[PDB]
């Protein structure tokens with residue numbers, strides 16, 4: 024879930 | 034009878050819910066592109082992609098969400114994605130009708146059969162009869178996202194504590210906006226039950242698309258575990 028974590032963390 | 038703190042909650046959720054877009058570029062395509070299963074699915078892809086970006090932005094701002102365990106954060110996000118998307122589609126559907134017919138025709142011709150598509154539109158009509166205000170759609174969306182019942186949640190009580198205040202708020206709003214129908218709140222929760230049947234329905238949609246050789250873009254693949 025790199026992409027989802029990336030969007031939640033920006 | 035919203036509390037001061039409830040009214041603050043409500044403003045915050047409302048501010049976040051309308052910090053949105055149907056980007057103009059996707060509207061332009063809906064109303065202007067060529068019409069084939071191929072183009073229509075590309076448009077649908079863009080629409081789904083926008084819904085998911087919107088969902089992520091809304092989710093991260095929900096009070097308390099940042100305090101949650103980081104794997105639970107993802108489990109809530111993935112667990113809510115289908116439900117939240119179709120609720121937002123229902124809101125939109127129920128807001129011109131030429132624009133609506135053209136969009137509906139695209140969705141009905143985006144590479145899978147009408148038995149997969151009709152149930153969405155019956156649901157949009159069903160919830161539409163309820164005449165919900167924007168505040169009701171926003172709180173319901175928050176309640177869908179902060180569900181303590183989703184698969185894989187490690188700390189369900191922490192999520193329940195964030196969901197409870199929203200349900201209290203929604204109950205009061207139902208009495209403010211529909212004072213003459215005291216079953217309104219109960220009806221909203223009955224439509225949530227209806228909404229949950231889309232999880233299985235969505236998975237069958239994806240399966241039909243993929244047998245038909247359609248591919249999904251990166252964000253959709255991740256959110257829906259394709």
Ligand SMILES: COc1cccc(-c2ccc(NC(=O)C3=C(C(=O)O)CCC3)c(F)c2)c1
Nearest residue numbers: 077078080081084122125126136140153238
């Ligand atoms: C590309 O992958 C998939 C897979 C499964 C469902 C969908 C889908 C289905 C329906 C909609 N949208 C709508 O039905 C409607 C509106 C909207 O999204 O804004 C408004 C009217 C109806 C939508 F935006 C996306 C996409």
